[PDB]
Each structure stands twice: as structure tokens, then as C-alpha cells.
Amino acid sequence: MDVFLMIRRHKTTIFTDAKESSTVFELKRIVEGILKRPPDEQRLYKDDQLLDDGKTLGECGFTSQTARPQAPATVGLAFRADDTFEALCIEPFSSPPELPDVMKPQ
Amino acid sequence: TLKPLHCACMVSDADCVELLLEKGAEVNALDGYNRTALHYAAEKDEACVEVLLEYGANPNALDGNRDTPLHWAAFKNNAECVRALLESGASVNALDYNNDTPLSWAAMKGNLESVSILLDYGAEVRVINLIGQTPISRLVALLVRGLGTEKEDSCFELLHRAVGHFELRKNGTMPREVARDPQLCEKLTVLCSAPGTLKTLARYAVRRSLGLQYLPDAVKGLPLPASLKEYLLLLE
Amino acid sequence: YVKLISSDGHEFIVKREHALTSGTIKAMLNEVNFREIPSHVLSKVCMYFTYKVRYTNSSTEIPEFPIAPEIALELLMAANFLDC
Amino acid sequence: NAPLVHATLETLLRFLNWIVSLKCLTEIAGVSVSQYEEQFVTLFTLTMMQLKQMLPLNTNIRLAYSNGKDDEQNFIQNLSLFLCTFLKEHDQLIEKRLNLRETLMEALHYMLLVSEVEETEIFKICLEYWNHLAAELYRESPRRQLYLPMLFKVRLLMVSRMAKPEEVTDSINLYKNMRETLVYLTHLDYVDTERIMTEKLHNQVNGTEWSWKNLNTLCWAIGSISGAMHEEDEKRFLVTVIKDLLGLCEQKRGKDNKAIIASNIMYIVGQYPRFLRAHWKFLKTVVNKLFEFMHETHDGVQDMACDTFIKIAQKCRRHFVQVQVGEVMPFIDEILNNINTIICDLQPQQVHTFYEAVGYMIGAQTDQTVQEHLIEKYMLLPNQVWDSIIQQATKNVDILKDPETVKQLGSILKTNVRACKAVGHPFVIQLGRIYLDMLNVYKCLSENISAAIQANGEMVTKQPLIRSMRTVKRETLKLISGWVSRSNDPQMVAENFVPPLLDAVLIDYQRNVPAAREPEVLSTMAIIVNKLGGHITAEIPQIFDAVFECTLNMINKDFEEYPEHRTNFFLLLQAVNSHCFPAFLAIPPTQFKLVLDSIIWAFKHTMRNVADTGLQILFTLLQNVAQEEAAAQSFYQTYFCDILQHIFSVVTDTSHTAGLTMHASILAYMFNLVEEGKISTSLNPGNPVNNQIFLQEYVANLLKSAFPHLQDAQVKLFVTGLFSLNQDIPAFKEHLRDFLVQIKEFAGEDTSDLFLEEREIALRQADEEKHKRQMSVPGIFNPHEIPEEMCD
Numbered sequence A: 001m002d003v004f005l006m007i008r009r010h011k012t013t014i015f016t017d018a019k020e021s022s023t024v025f026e027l028k029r030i031v032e033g034i035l036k037r038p039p040d041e042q043r044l045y046k047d048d049q050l051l052d053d054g055k056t057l058g059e060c061g062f063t064s065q066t067a068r069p070q071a072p073a074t075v076g077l078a079f080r081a082d083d084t085f086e087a088l089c090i091e092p093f094s095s096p097p098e099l100p101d102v103m104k105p106q
Numbered sequence B: 001t002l003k004p005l006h007c008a009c010m011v012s013d014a015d016c017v018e019l020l021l022e023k024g025a026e027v028n029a030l031d032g033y034n035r036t037a038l039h040y041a042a043e044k045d046e047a048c049v050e051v052l053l054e055y056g057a058n059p060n061a062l063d064g065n066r067d068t069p070l071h072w073a074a075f076k077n078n079a080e081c082v083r084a085l086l087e088s089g090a091s092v093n094a095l096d097y098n099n100d101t102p103l104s105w106a107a108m109k110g111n112l113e114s115v116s117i118l119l120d121y122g123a124e125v126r127v128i129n130l131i132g133q134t135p136i137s138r139l140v141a142l143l144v145r146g147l148g149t150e151k152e153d154s155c156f157e158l159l160h161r162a163v164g165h166f167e168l169r170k171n172g173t174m175p176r177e178v179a180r181d182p183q184l185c186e187k188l189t190v191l192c193s194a195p196g197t198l199k200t201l202a203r204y205a206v207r208r209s210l211g212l213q214y215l216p217d218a219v220k221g222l223p224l225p226a227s228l229k230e231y232l233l234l235l236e
Numbered sequence C: 001y002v003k004l005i006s007s008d009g010h011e012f013i014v015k016r017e018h019a020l021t022s023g024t025i026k027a028m029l030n031e032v033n034f035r036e037i038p039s040h041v042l043s044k045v046c047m048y049f050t051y052k053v054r055y056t057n058s059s060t061e062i063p064e065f066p067i068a069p070e071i072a073l074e075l076l077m078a079a080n081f082l083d084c
Numbered sequence D: 001n002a003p004l005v006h007a008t009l010e011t012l013l014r015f016l017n018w019i020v021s022l023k024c025l026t027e028i029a030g031v032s033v034s035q036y037e038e039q040f041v042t043l044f045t046l047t048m049m050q051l052k053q054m055l056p057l058n059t060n061i062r063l064a065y066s067n068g069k070d071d072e073q074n075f076i077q078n079l080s081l082f083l084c085t086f087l088k089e090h091d092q093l094i095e096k097r098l099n100l101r102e103t104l105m106e107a108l109h110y111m112l113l114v115s116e117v118e119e120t121e122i123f124k125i126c127l128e129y130w131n132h133l134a135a136e137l138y139r140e141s142p143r144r145q146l147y148l149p150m151l152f153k154v155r156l157l158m159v160s161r162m163a164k165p166e167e168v169t170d171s172i173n174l175y176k177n178m179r180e181t182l183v184y185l186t187h188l189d190y191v192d193t194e195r196i197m198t199e200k201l202h203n204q205v206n207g208t209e210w211s212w213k214n215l216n217t218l219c220w221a222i223g224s225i226s227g228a229m230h231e232e233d234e235k236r237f238l239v240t241v242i243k244d245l246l247g248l249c250e251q252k253r254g255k256d257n258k259a260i261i262a263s264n265i266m267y268i269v270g271q272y273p274r275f276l277r278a279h280w281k282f283l284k285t286v287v288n289k290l291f292e293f294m295h296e297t298h299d300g301v302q303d304m305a306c307d308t309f310i311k312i313a314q315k316c317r318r319h320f321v322q323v324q325v326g327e328v329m330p331f332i333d334e335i336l337n338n339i340n341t342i343i344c345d346l347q348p349q350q351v352h353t354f355y356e357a358v359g360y361m362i363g364a365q366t367d368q369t370v371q372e373h374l375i376e377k378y379m380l381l382p383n384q385v386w387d388s389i390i391q392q393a394t395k396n397v398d399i400l401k402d403p404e405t406v407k408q409l410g411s412i413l414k415t416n417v418r419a420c421k422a423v424g425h426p427f428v429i430q431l432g433r434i435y436l437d438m439l440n441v442y443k444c445l446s447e448n449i450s451a452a453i454q455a456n457g458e459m460v461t462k463q464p465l466i467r468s469m470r471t472v473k474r475e476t477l478k479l480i481s482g483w484v485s486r487s488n489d490p491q492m493v494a495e496n497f498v499p500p501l502l503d504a505v506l507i508d509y510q511r512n513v514p515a516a517r518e519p520e521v522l523s524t525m526a527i528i529v530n531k532l533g534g535h536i537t538a539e540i541p542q543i544f545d546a547v548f549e550c551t552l553n554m555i556n557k558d559f560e561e562y563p564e565h566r567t568n569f570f571l572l573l574q575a576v577n578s579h580c581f582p583a584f585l586a587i588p589p590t591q592f593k594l595v596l597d598s599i600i601w602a603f604k605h606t607m608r609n610v611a612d613t614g615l616q617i618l619f620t621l622l623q624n625v626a627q628e629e630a631a632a633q634s635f636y637q638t639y640f641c642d643i644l645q646h647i648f649s650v651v652t653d654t655s656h657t658a659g660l661t662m663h664a665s666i667l668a669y670m671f672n673l674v675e676e677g678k679i680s681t682s683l684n685p686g687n688p689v690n691n692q693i694f695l696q697e698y699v700a701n702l703l704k705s706a707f708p709h710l711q712d713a714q715v716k717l718f719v720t721g722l723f724s725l726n727q728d729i730p731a732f733k734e735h736l737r738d739f740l741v742q743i744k745e746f747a748g749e750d751t752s753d754l755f756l757e758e759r760e761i762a763l764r765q766a767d768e769e770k771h772k773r774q775m776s777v778p779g780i781f782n783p784h785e786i787p788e789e790m791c792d
Ligand SMILES: *[C@@H](CC(=O)OC(C)C)n1cnc(-c2cc(OC)cc(C(F)(F)F)c2)n1
Pocket: B145, D246, D249, D250, D255, D258, D259, D261, D262, D265, D266, D269, D285, D286, D287, D289, D290, D296, D301
């Protein structure tokens, strides 16, 4: 029914929502709304896989159970520049600090 | 049906049990009812409990139904006895034949001192017995019975803060006995509906990670502000 | 759309209403910047905001928030700084 | 020789009353003489020393008695008797002798262990001694310092051996003594006894000593102490006990174990109305749990649930009608809404119990209209069933011959009777709703039973159908009697209910066969006349015409034929003679003569109650007739001599010692009445003569006939003294008693029977003093018997 996503690029992240029946085109249009870069200059990548605009989101690797709000499914985003698509540069989040000894599992 | 140590603990005389163990009495010997002298000591007096533990007694000695002495100490509300047992190496998550952890019994009776002491040692509030009564469910039933005073209300507050989040509804319906108390039903519905503040969830995760330790001592080692330490110890 | 910045360079953009869940955010509130929150903690916080708005006033069972032990402490500190 | 020595010892035992070894010592302390204090002290010391020499206290004397033969068993029994008697009479002597404190300690230690023995005689003696001790110590407010370290064992024994309460003869007395001792002991120390009950209940939860008998005795001990503690301590203790028992119910498994636990808790909550009253929410939960229980299959739990529901309804009537905190509508409305489902699977007696409880609950609705609607809903189901029956009868009258229909009507009317008993006057609406059809069905059933008797005879009265219809008529009359006794509008009853009631009842009573006449008719007429003092005065003559003529003959011949009919007839006659005396004069004189004959018979035969009622009716008739001059002279000249002679005749026989005071009273009244000339005519119709002198000579002749052996002078002086003292009732009675004593002495006969009348009254006053003394200490009387509802 409801799918919760996470669009990322370099150090930028976007939180949104959609529907399984919804196509990739409307997700691209939301990308426009937040970033204002024409859709033809935007291509979405899931775990290093290309996504088609006309292909429905539901038939893609996303489901309500798979994309619960507490664990959204990351989606790669790349900006097309000077008539070519940039590399899928995704910046991983900072590593968590080392676990303190007292809290360490016994 | 009981050895002299059992009777000495029944009368709750620490001196008699001490002098009896000084000559080498079999402390862990079982009696007819499948009880151990520690079970009797843990129902009456803390001094007897300490004296008995001084001689290598098993704080996990299982009774006929696997009710460890901690279970009886909690049920009787002997806060000092419960503290003495737990500090001595008792299993704060010990399960009897019905999977009734001592916290479940203490909540069932509703007493507060024992529940606080247990939670200080890391008792798991999410424990479910075989029938399916969480400590919070039993305490809420007791409150619905109308026997709940400010003590029981404070105990419920402690449990609710510790559990992090609890959902009493059966599917979409609350238990029948709750449904007949409209104001308490409203309070429980509002408490259950809310997802819960992020801070409480994080506190519960930290407590679970620290579990099975004297939490105040453990948290003292953490680098957080003293306010957040008090928050972790369920002071807010 | 609200814009959030972590202590280290990371831009989190969430929907306006969701960011309003935090009292500190609402009091502060176009661009909100943080000097202490690391990126992973902030992503967890955004997850929490989405979860909170989604499951508020729910009737069915409420799924539990998954917190890894290592980030639990930092997440608690961040939530305490905020008002959620 | 030895046999002669034993015979001499037995003779000494026999003669000690007026002038087996322990028996001689047992009666020594019974002298009750303050002198010889040092002696009495000395005897105790030597006896117990020898006892200890031949029987140390360390011995488990319980087992010795269990295995001991008769010779030693009697030894311990007499030992206990002597110790208990001497202590009850001389414990004060020993206690002040601090030099012999060890003697008292050993004596009480012996006392504690002997009570362990289970045989009823020894335990009863020990319980009597313990109750006396508890009463004595409580009388201080000094002395408890002497026994306080040992009183604990007394509490353990008392709670341990608690008898069966009559809410779950020798048993009654044992229970009363147990309760009094227990309440005294708890009044001595609340903390220790509360701790003891809590410890025993825990041990029951602990798994040790789980025997059902232990649970039941502990719960009886807890329940019987109701009201002995202050409010707050009661709250705490009862909360702890409820918690522990609920914990037991979950722990234990098996309907057999569940059922026993349920009965215990229902009994405990049945007591302590105060606590249940203060905690509204707990009361609601309790009532809901009872409603759930009523569908329970096990009979004992269900019956106990209904009984406890009665107990709760009686002491908490108000709370169910007022709107309580946190509630929208009063709980009575909720209960009335779900009445159909709750009562299901209850036996008819249980349904009557439940409706009686509800009626008690509706009786607190002070607001008129609210109570009106509450009652209209309350009787909705019984009334609709009744209307269905009435409609079916209207279609055809034959539906009254169905045993099922008659049984159902009896059930409905029994429910109505219980409802009227609980509610009271406001019930008139329902009674006003079903009254007409009630009397119509009464008439139809009476006609049918009459036809059955006529066709068959008096044997058919045993048939189930006939006895069921008689039950229906009995219930109708009981309902009317209850309402009228509880009614408060004399004019309304005199106007609406009386005429149809008389029409339906009186003629049928006269016409039926003697075996098919219900004394409830007489009871109801007595009730209605007693209430409506004057308004019934118009209809009295037909009542006496239809009822009195037939009933009188039915009773006089045999004194054991209809015990109830005679009592109800005498009650009716007394009530009419007390509240409608002007009616008699309007009656033809033959009926008055019949009434006088019946009254004369009433005090002739030896039945005590009948004699008392007859004498009272005669005295009241003498008092009342003095206010009607027109017929007073005729009544005097006709019956005065006859009644007077009959009174001597019964008195001369001395067969009614209890009524002798009444005999003297009426004799003095008659002597005074004739003395002052109110007679207004000569006692001899054929010739004038001094009425006083005629009375003197007549009584002298009658006494001579009764006692020919007596001389003229004695009779003359006796009558002279008696007639003079007519103005003083005590002096008249004293003179009559002295004369009778002199007659008995002349005949050489005992006169104790005369004195029994005085000492029975004396011991009645003693019993009243004992009763009121108990009321001083709270808790000796159980809450559901004291007449204190507190309107809350
Ligand atoms: C346990 C289950 C039960 O009712 O078993 C019977 C055999 C059906 N149990 C026993 N008695 C109670 C109980 C609980 C109450 O809670 C307030 C109140 C009562 C009451 F009868 F005294 F009202 C009884 N539960």
C-alpha cells in the first residue's frame, strides 16, 4: 500500500513516500520538486541497478513489508551533467563509535 | 517432612540457622515439600537469608515447581531479601514451570519496592509467561479490580517507563475487564496508540544492552550528562 | 521542505510536517544546521520522524523501532538534544 | 477394705454437694467462699506438684490421650475440669502470688496442650475457659502482662480450630463462643492476629498445608472477625487477603480446587460490608464476578454466589441506585438491563433469592418517579409472564388445570411476595397492576379445588395438582398480607383492596370442606383488621358470620388437629377485640356467646400459649366492655358470675402457674368493678341483694366446694383480705400466692412451681443483660444481624 523510500546522492538525502502502483516517473517528479533538475537529467539507481521511468515501482524490488518506515530502502541518485550521466557517487554515513566496554555483550 | 534447618528458617531465627550450619548441616538438602531452607528464609527474614547464603547455599535452588527463592522473596515483597539474593548471584530472569519471572510475580501482586529493585538489576519487562500475562497486564488487571492505590499507580508508572512500549489490545479490542472502566480504558488506549517518544525507545535499548548488571553502577561508567543517567535509571 | 544538516557534511531533506514533530526543530523553524549530530544518528532520527507520523494514533500493532546497540547511546543523546 | 473405701469415696462425692479423686477436688472450688484464701492457695500447689511428678509437661499428652485407655483419659478430663474451674474461680488468687508465678506458668502450659485433643468434651471445656479468660482480660480496659507472652498460642489455637459458620444447638453455641473469644483476643492485639492470619494464608499459598480443611477454617477465622478492627486496618488486611486468595485461584488447578477457593472468597467478601461499601469499583467488580458465577455448573458455588449477593444487596442498597463517581447511569439500571441473562441457569429458589436482592436494592430510591420506573422495569419479566398466563386463561379457563401453569403461577407469586417483602409500600403499583387478575385466579383455583374435593373427598388433598393450587392460594394471601402489613394508606386499602378481597375469600372459606380451608385466610384477616383499626369496623360482622361460626367447631373438639388454624383464629379474635370492639355489639348475641365460650375454653386446657392468649383476650374484653354502657349491664349480669367461677376453677386447680399473675390481675379488676357499683344491677336476677356480700358468699361456697377440707373462717378472712386488696395488683397477687401456699402446706404439696414464674423472668432479664453486654464490644455480633444499616 504505502512505501517509504530514501533518495541519496553524494551527501544529500531525501525522505518521501509513494505507492506500489505508482510509477518511477512520479518519484522522478518528486526529485524535481526537491532539486529542480529536469527529469531527463535524472536517473534512479537501486543497489547499482538501473530503473525505468515507465516501469511501475510496485513491480520493482520494493514492497510495503520490504520498505517499512523504520527501515526504508535506499535508492541511488545521480545527476546528469554536461550531456552525460555522472558516476553513482553515494557517500556512506559516518561509522558509529566503538562500543563501550561496560555495554559490551557478555 | 522437613529437616531442622527448615523449621529454624520457618521460625525465622538467624542465630539458630547460623549455629546449625557452623557444625556442617547440609544446607541444600531438600525436604518433603521439595523446598530448601533458603526458600523459607526468603519468605520471612533477610538476616536469615544472608546467614544461609554464607555457607555456599544455592540461590537458584529449584523448588517442586522451580520457584527459586527470588520468586518467593519478590512475591512476599521482602525488598531487602530480594536485594540480598540478587546481589549474591541470583538469576533475575529465573523461570519456574510457568515461565513466571520474579518480576511477573511482583507485578501480579503490584508491590513497588521489589519491582524497583528488580528493574535496577535488569529484569526484562517484556517477559511473557506461558499463559500470556506480561507484568504490565497483570498490574493493569489489579488496577481494574479497584484495589490499586497510589503505590500501585506508581508501580505502573515505573513499569510503563521501563517497558518503553506496551500494547494490551487483543487485535483491535482491549481485554473485557478493562473495557468496563471507561476512564481507565481511555487512558490505556491513549498510552497504547502513541508510537512512543524516541527518547524512551533509546533508553530501553541502552538498558537492554546493559542488562544483567547493577545498572546504576554500569551507567555511572557512561559519559552522558547526569540528567540522562537519571533518565536511564527510570527517574523520569 | 525543511532542510537538515548534520555535524559532518550530510544534507537530510524531510517533509515539512514530519520535521515539525521535534519541538526543538519547530522552535528553531528554512535550513536547519546541527553542530553535533553525526550523519548516521541524523538518518536514524529522520527514520523516527517518518515512523512517528506514520503510526501516530494507530489501531493495529505498532512495530518496534530497531535500534542497534552501538548507536543507541548516540541516538538517545540526539533525541535528548531535540524534543521528540 | 478397698471396695468399702471406694464406696465411701463415692458417698463423699455424692454428699459433697450439700455438706475419680480429681472429681472430689473439682467440686471443692465450687463452694465460692472468699474465706480460707490461704487454704485454697495451698491445695493448688500440692496438686500440681504431684501431677508434674506423675506427669511432666514435656509429655505429648495429646498422643497419650489418643492411646490412653479409659482410666487415664478420665484422669486428664477431670484434670482439665479442675484446672479450668479453679482458675475461673481462683485465678485471681494465684496471679497476685508472684512467689508462685511458676505455678501459674505451668498451669497455663498444661491448659494449652490439653486443648490440642480433638474430642468434643475436652475441647469445649478448654474453649469455655479460654473465652472466660479473654472476656476477663478485655474487662481491664494491669493484668495482660501475666499472659501476653503466651496469648499468641491461644490465637493460633483459636484460628486453627475455628468451627463452621452458619453462613457457608451445640454447633451454634460452639460457634458463638468461638467468635466471642476470637473477637476479644483480636481486640487485645490487632497487629499480632493480623500477622497470624496473613502468615497462615501465605502458607496456604506457599504450597505447604494445602488441605482444604485448613483453607476453610482459616477463611472462617478471617470472616468471623468482621468489624473487630478499625477501618484503615480493615482496608489493609482485607486487601492483602484478597490479593493472596486471587493468587491462589490462579495457582491452583482443578474445578474442585477452584470451587472451594471461590466459596471462601465469596464468604469473606460477604462479610465486611463496610470495606466493600467504601470501594465502589471493587464492589462493581465483585458483583460482576458473582453474576458470572451464577452460570457456574457446580451447585455449591452457585448457591453461595446467590447468598452472598443477598448479603451484599442488604448492606449496600443505596450505592446501586445513586449515580456513582465515574459512572453515567446508576448500577441498578445496568443490572435491570441484563437481568434476563444473569438469572439463566438458576433454580427457582435461586431466582427468588436474586429478585429479593434486587428488591432490596430498589428500596433506596427515594425519588418517587425514579422508583416508579425502577419498579415498573423490575417486574417486567414476572409481569409479562403473568399477563401471558392471564391471556391464556381468558382464551380458555382450562389452562389453570395444567400442573406446569399452576407451578409457574406459584413461582411468579413467590417472586412477587419476595419483591413486596424487600420493597414495601411503593410496591402498590405492581400489586395494583396484578390485583384484579390475582383475585380472579384465586376464585377459579378455589372453585376447582372445591370441585375436586367434592368429586373425590378429603384424600385427594395429597395430589400434586391440588397441593400446588393450594400453594398458589397461600401465596396470594401471603402477598396481600405482606403488603397490607407493610402498607401506609389506611383509606386506600379500606376502599380498593378490602371489598374484592372479602368477596373472594370469606364465602369460599365458609363453604369449603374443613380439610380444604387455609389458615392463611385467618392470618390475612387478622393482619388487615390489625392495620385498619377502624375502617374494617363496618365489615366485621360478615367476617365473623362466615369465618367464626365454622372455624370454632373445627378446633374445639381436638387440640392436635389443626395447630395453625387455632393460632390464626386466636390472633384474629384478639385483633378484632383490640381494634374493633364496637363491632361485637352489632353482632347478634349468639355470636358473642360463642366468642365467650371459645375464650373460656382458651384458658382452661393446659397448652401454655393458648392459655396466655385466652387470658389476655379475656382481660382486654373486660377492659373494653366497660366503655359500652348499653350492653355492659347485660354482659355483667349474664357472664360475670360464669367467667368469675371459671377463673377460680382453673385457678383452684393451679394447672397454669404462668398465668396465675394474669388470674390475679383479672380477679382484682372484677373485684374493683363490682366494688364501685358499676354493675348497676343485683347479682341475683330474682331478688335484690348486696352485690359485694353476694360475691363474698358465692366465692366462699365455690372455695368450699373446691376445698371442702377447709374451714369457714379461713375462707372468710382470705376473701376479706383479697377483696380489700383489689385496688393494688401486687398486693392482690401476694395475697393470692400466700393463700395458695397455705393451701398447699395444708395438703402437704410442693409450691416450687409458683416460684418458677419469678425465676424464669429473672433469668430472662439476665439473658437480656448478657445480650446487651456483648453489643458493647464491636464484632461480637456479625454485621448482617445488627439492626444498623447506616443508610449507606
Ligand atoms: C478464580 C476463578 C474462578 O472464579 O473459579 C470459579 C470456580 C469459577 N477465582 C475464584 N474466585 C475468584 C474471585 C475473584 C474476585 O475478584 C474480585 C472476586 C470473587 C468474589 F466472588 F468474591 F466476588 C471471586 N476468582
